[PDB]
């Protein structure tokens, strides 16, 4: 499981950064959201409480999976902007 950050974009209107990355992992299952978030946080020194994984997508006959993440400046801003379902999916909300 090797993570390569293909693109980082700085959104200032919404106080966040959007990270597009790829996960190379031949002969392994699709990495879990918890593991992907942990590795991404450890690599990019992001705040674990304000980072959310939008999607991790696998493709047909490919050892690379695409991933999209958002790191917000503030937890209040992240709650205000992000939908409830994605926060529940990522485990940021007990609901």
């Amino acid at each position: 499981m090797e993570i390569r950050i293909k693109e980082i974009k700085e959104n200032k209107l919404i106080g966040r950064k959007e990270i597009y990355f790829e996960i190379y992992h031949p002969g392994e299952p699709t990495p879990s959201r918890k593991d992907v978030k942990g590795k991404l946080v450890a690599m990019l020194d992001l705040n674990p409480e304000t980072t959310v994984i939008q999607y991790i997508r696998s493709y047909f006959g490919s050892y690379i999976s695409k991933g999209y993440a958002k790191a917000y400046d503030s937890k209040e801003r992240m709650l205000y902007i992000e939908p409830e379902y994605i926060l529940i999916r990522d485990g940021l909300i007990e609901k």
Binding site: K12, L13, I14, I81
Partner: protein, 242 residues
């Protein structure tokens, strides 16, 4: 079966000047009435979301617009159905970005980056001139905007002229007349986004529109409509028009 005004707009029936995926979804934003026409404008939601990518969903795009982080000309617009037309200035002060909305060679609307010094100037083509109460001259521009001047300056303005107005203060900087050798920018037709200098003007009987001949930078002569010719300078373009 129709009993009144329409309120919806299918994607397949959207104007051809939009950079929109006509088959991704079924519905498109029906533009609210405003400055320009339907064919020379696009709702602000598309500019915020698709053109610039600052938002992924209409909900967060509307949140950004309501937070007053987008400026058209010099005024903040919070309506996601607000039309943005030709020669409009879109300003994002939080990122220090300024764009001029212009048609390209195939008639589609694009945003061309400009500088801060140019972001305060908006050319306006005088569409009509009339009189109002009190013997005052009212000028109506290509984007529906209006200005009022005294009868003393009635000879300083004419139709097809261009007024360089400072926004949002709405102050006239200068007037570019429509005459031979004046730089023009074609805004509609088959010769969209072409620029050059006036060569000749031909008039026709009845209600047929006048035609103007323009010589481009390469020496080629091409004809277009006088109302389609947009004066942007005297000998050189006073605004960035690439």
């Amino acid at each position: 079966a129709r009993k009144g005004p329409k309120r919806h707009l299918k994607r397949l029936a959207a104007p051809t000047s939009w950079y929109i995926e006509r088959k991704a979804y079924k519905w498109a934003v029906r533009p609210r009435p405003g400055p320009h026409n339907m064919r020379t404008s696009i709702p602000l939601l598309y500019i915020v979301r698709d053109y610039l990518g600052y938002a992924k969903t209409a909900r967060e795009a509307r949140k950004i617009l309501n937070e007053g982080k987008f400026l058209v000309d010099g005024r903040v617009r919070k309506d996601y159905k607000f039309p943005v037309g030709i020669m409009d200035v879109v300003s994002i002060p939080e990122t220090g970005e300024h764009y001029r909305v212009l048609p390209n060679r195939i008639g589609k609307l694009i945003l061309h980056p400009i500088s801060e010094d140019e972001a305060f100037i908006k050319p306006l083509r005088i569409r009509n001139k009339r009189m109002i109460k009190g013997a005052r001259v009212q000028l109506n521009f290509h984007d529906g905007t209006n200005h009022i001047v005294s009868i003393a300056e009635k000879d300083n303005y004419f139709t097809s002229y261009t007024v360089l107005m400072k926004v949002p203060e709405r102050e006239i900087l200068e007037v570019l007349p429509f005459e031979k050798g004046a730089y023009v920018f074609v805004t509609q037709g088959k010769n969209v986004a072409r620029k050059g200098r006036i060569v000749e003007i031909k008039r026709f009987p009845m209600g047929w529109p006048d035609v103007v001949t323009i010589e481009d930078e390469e020496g080629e002569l091409f004809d277009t409509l006088k109302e389609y010719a947009f004066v942007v300078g005297t000998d050189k373009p006073k605004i960035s028009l690439p």
